[PDB]
Design a protein around this nucleic acid. Sequence first.
RNA 1: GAUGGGGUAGCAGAACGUUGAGUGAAUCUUAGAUUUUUUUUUUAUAACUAAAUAUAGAUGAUAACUCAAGUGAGAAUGGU
Lengths: 49, 137, 182, 161, 58, 40, 48, 350, 133, 183
Amino acid sequence: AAVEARNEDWMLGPLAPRRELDEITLSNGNFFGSLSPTRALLESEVSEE
Amino acid sequence: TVKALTQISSAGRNGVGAFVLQCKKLDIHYSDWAGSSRGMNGFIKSLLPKFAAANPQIEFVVSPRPAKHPILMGHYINGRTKAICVRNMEPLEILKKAELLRDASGEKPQKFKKPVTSTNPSVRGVWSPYHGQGMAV
Amino acid sequence: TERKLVYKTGYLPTSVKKLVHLSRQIRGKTVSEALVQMQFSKKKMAKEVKTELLRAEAKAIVTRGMGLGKAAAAAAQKETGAEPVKIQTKDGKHLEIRDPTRIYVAETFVNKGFTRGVELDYRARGRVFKMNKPTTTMTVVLKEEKTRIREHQERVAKKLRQGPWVHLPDRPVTSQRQFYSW
Amino acid sequence: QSTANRTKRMLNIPPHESFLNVPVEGDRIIFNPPSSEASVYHTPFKFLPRSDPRRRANIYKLFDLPPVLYNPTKSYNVTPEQVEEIRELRAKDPKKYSVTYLSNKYNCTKVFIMMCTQAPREHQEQHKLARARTAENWGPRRAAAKLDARRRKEMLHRGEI
Amino acid sequence: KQVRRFIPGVGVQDEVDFSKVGAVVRDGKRAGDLGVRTRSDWEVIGKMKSVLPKVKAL
Amino acid sequence: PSQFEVTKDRKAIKARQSKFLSGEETWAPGKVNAFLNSKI
Amino acid sequence: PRRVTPVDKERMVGRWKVIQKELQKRELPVLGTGNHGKYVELKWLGSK
Amino acid sequence: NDRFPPLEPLPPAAESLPSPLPERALTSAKLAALHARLNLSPKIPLQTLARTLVDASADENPQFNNANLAFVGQTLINYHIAEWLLCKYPRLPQGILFSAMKAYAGPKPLLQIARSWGVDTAAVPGGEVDPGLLQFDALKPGVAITNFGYKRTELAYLEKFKWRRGMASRVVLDDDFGDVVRSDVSYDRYGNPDTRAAAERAHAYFVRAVVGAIYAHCGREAAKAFVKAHIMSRTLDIAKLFEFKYPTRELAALCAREDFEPPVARLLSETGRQSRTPVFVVGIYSGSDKLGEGAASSLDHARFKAAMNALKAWYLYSPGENPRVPSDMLEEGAKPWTPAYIDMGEVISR
Amino acid sequence: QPPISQQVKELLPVLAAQPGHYTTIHIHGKPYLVTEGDTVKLPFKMPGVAPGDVLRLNRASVIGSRDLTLQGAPYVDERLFECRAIVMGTESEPMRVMIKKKRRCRKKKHVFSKHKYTVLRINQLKINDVSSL
Amino acid sequence: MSQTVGATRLAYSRVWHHISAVTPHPTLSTIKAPSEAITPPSLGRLASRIATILMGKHKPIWDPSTDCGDYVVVTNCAGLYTTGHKKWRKTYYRHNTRPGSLQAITMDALMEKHGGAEVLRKAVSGMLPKNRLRDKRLARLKAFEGDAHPYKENLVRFGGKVVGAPGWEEAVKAIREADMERL
RNA sequence: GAUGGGGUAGCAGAACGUUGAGUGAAUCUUAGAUUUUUUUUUUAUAACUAAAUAUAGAUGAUAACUCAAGUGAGAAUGGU
Ligand SMILES: [Mg+2]
Ligand SMILES: [Mg+2]
Ligand SMILES: [Mg+2]
Ligand SMILES: [Mg+2]
Ligand SMILES: [Mg+2]
């Protein structure tokens, strides 16, 4: 998404969209510029290696 | 009253009055490591020196290009390029390929349709049914 | 210079052959016209298209800033007394645009989605066939009337650049021969 | 056809019979006037200077007229005093004393009346408006045909038609 | 009229104008032996800052 | 989609929609979509 | 003697000296990748 | 760095200089190829051919640039093309004569000639670029070559209030083509209609400076041969430069001036009258002599086309395809000069 | 040499005086109707010629103007005209593949053909003055 | 290529030719002696000449893809010349794919319903290439039963004299003689 | 100024490509290795030029020569 956002801002210029005001991404349920509790707290169980 | 049109300019006919070779530059890339360039390296030492001395109107640039096959990239006055990969070719095969780029123009290859190409008008004009002896059915 | 929003709806419980006809209906219309046609359509997905079209119009206004010049448009024309712009779409429909910021459905296509479910069709002679319950999505590209004005001015200039019709055209003779035939 | 060689033979057109009667035992120069329109570089003898030696009898010699289409006649029926009458009248009432009325009165062309005097600027603007109002009554099909007629004329005088 | 060319086996053949007839072919291991202008021939030309076309010619 | 319970993100985009349309707020381009060094 | 890179070509045409000032003005790297470091979002989660 | 040593050694002050030094021209393979591509005489060193590629916009010094070299070459090009048109077409109207000159020695053709030679431009001038590249800055239009025209006292009104400008005065006040006289940096931008005119101007000054270089080193005859080989060799249809207004009146005035019988239009042939694409072949006669002929799909158009072709035949009269030029007498050992044909002037009609 | 006929010596100046002239040159027996400035693309690679070589063409069957036409029985005398060309280079066509195949036989034999063509530029076509001969 | 660089306007224009089906034709007739026996062109011999004009094959710029044909106005088609007993023994057939619906008619009976113009259209139609230019080319054939037709102003002229008129060849020669007074 | 030129069953010769291996602890790669695309050129079942997109320093890619085969598919009412 950051690859798509950097290009969009470069081309539109004064028409750059206000993504912070958009709806959540249903693929993960996160807002704009927001992490997930599992990813911000690093509660994922990792291998013993 | 006659008003002059100032949007038409003269066109050049390369060959009439003066000639200009279309090939203006030849990029010769080799590799000291690739085995496909064993012949190219021999062409640069044995035949390129004399070939370049005979074509002073062409700019020859010898530069290494390791990890890549050897190529002959010609640049033409029309602004196009023609690159020929000469991998696994012997020195005399390189020379025959270099003479191809010199004798060639940047124009894209085209099938043979018409021998003659002219821009000047017909000497006898174009046929018209209103300028002959008429035709009775 | 021209604002645009590409909105992909959620997965609707229908097929492509069914939803394609509702997409082609709202194609080229304004958002207001399309919403009125979805409200009074006998199709079941027309209710979903209306909901998704209102959602798209909300993202177009908040995220892209479309349809935010209606007040300034009326003052520019009604007070001035000038004549609005008259254009003609690619299909040939004539329009009279008073607000260049009005949002309209520029592009619309339907896409196939994941399989909703599977239903077993039990037939005679002990034969069973799997029926697939489909899902499909619709994508709408919303733009402002500035785009239809520009695209119209380009088609007009292209037609004016093709030159007029002449009675005696200088058609070329294509065959070359090494002699004179006249 | 199957190949370009065969297509060339099926579309073949023989050369002109003049080139077929080739000579024998030596060279030859024949008179072969083509059935075509000549270029403007074949200057007629009437436009050559008296010094130009190339002036010479026709090549045919070295080996009534068609119908009239436009033969105008100039006339001078107006006198220096009548020209003043045309000026005072045109400025007194350009609506009544139009150019057609003055043309028929003094037996002149409508152009000459416009060379001696012009209507006041106020009467001229309403003329351009009257022609602009009738132009907005044209549809897209008639307005396009009118513009094509105005372009063909310009192209003609540019040598493009 | 034949322009300058390089024959692989013989060497470099200078320009010849058969209309006025002289195909001289020069071979060697140095540039000066081939009969062509070298970087040195261009440096001596640039240092001849005194040669000037005759006023009549100008 | 007609029966999805409108979440808090949907309720926030509908409130702004009324502000931009009414004229309370003047729309401006984004500034946090991407952190470019060019800033253009 | 060495490979002709896009940088050398710009230097021959004169454009390189113009590219340096711009990249430096925008605090972008000239002939390098900078001091930013490699992607770590997947590394921190335990990706292999 | 250690892995990427510089390809062409250059002192640190190289980038500071506006143009590469003269001695650098002796190590450029583009120059040596360009010098041979044009078959220039060895009398022209590489340091001189390098100076012809530096526009005044890249180096403001009177030397190191094209200013003076291009002025001398412009005078030779314009002179040899002018005397050549008046001897091949001595009846050309003045307006058509200005366009014919601008069609041969104008910025448009010279741009095509410079490109016909394989001359590439430098992105931005500097002492680090290859001496074989054309150097100029399209962002600076404050450079202008000296000419022989003067600034009109009414130029301000000529452009604003559409004041009238005659043709007879363009020979004294305007330039050689009839045009009036006097008509940090950031590269984050696109082209402009001004940068194109500045680039097209730079290529033109280069072609002119090459002619001036040949004149300074080789001589006068060498310069004429070069102009006659790359410029006069081009092809131009002057008949396509004519645009008539009321050609029927100009032809009537011509016949009246030369005392010919009044022109009469006659229908030589016709077919398709009362159709969508007829063909009326009209011929204009002055007595019994056929002056011009034109075929159109209307009676009026066919009559106008016939008069236009009659006027072109008068103006496009040519004593010969390769006529003698008064410049040939400067070359000693030439036959006596025969007086050329001098026309009275273009017809002025209502 | 065989003297020119009086009928040709009388009209050749009239032929050379007209504005335009064309000629039908013969290269290896094949005709080519050309004019000064035309480009000829021969359907074969002329051996022993490099770009910049000048050729003198000496086999013309027809040298004519708008109204007059000089005809040579086998060819026109070389003393009456001077036609010269310059080799511009060598062009090529795109590779074309001919697939030779019969019905009910899977073997598809390919033939790859890419021919080279020499290009000329007619830079001189003039008629000489025969008042001396 | 020089022979084709120029103005092809007049080569592609539509010329309006004229021929009478009653005027003797020494070239298309089979009888060539005595002079009083020279007949007009027979139906098929006339149709073969017309099909050449409609195709444009009399033009040196002819190409079958281009529709470079001309018009042909035929008059006096009521006196269409025929040999033997064609007029009363030749039959024209017609079917519409329905068994039993075979329509037959003799030449004399067809000339009674649609005149000799239809007999000539059918003869020319079968002599034209069977492609998408057959209907256009056949439409340019203008056949009329008598001397009256709406194209008496379209017929090609040379000095005001229509081709085929008494003195049209003298008007042509007079124009070419005055055309050689130029370089 | 060499001679020769259709081809089934079938016989024979010469090569390309695919996968893995040796030289290889080798060569090259943010001055862009690799990117299923597009494009350009070269007598070309193949490689090459350039462009666009993304971004790797080796669990990456690779010339040449050689070694070994689970090595080349519009055809089996073939299989998934
Ligand atoms: Mg059961
Ligand atoms: Mg055989
Ligand atoms: Mg065989
Ligand atoms: Mg890729
Ligand atoms: Mg299968």
